[PDB]
């Protein structure tokens, strides 16, 4: 509970299951969404799936999925030092159908 700083931008490198890694040049606010928004596209920009963010933790093997509010950044600190953790791209990945 200590953040009081903004400077340089957060390159956050996303994941995508194919495996070529998309970074994204956000700072301290795009949240989960901002980045599938900016993935997906930017220009025009119709609206496509709702789609999200995934955070691998390439150590413990563990797949957490996270909502659009939820800040990559926020997210992305909570990560642990030991673990080069890393966010992931998919339309796919619950448990239970809803289709919305």
Do not use: I
Request: hydrophobic content about 35%; charged content about 20%; some cysteine.
């Amino acid at each position: 509970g200590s953040s009081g700083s903004s400077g340089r931008p957060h390159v956050v490198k996303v994941y995508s299951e194919d495996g070529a890694c998309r970074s994204v040049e956000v700072a301290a606010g795009a949240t989960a969404r901002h980045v599938c928004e900016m993935l997906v596209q930017r220009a025009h920009a119709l609206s496509d799936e709702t789609w999200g963010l995934v955070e691998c933790h390439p150590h413990l093997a563990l797949e957490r999925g996270l909502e659009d509010h939820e800040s990559v950044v926020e997210v992305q600190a909570a990560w642990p030092v030991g673990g080069d953790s890393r966010f992931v791209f998919r339309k796919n990945f619950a448990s239970g159908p809803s289709s919305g």
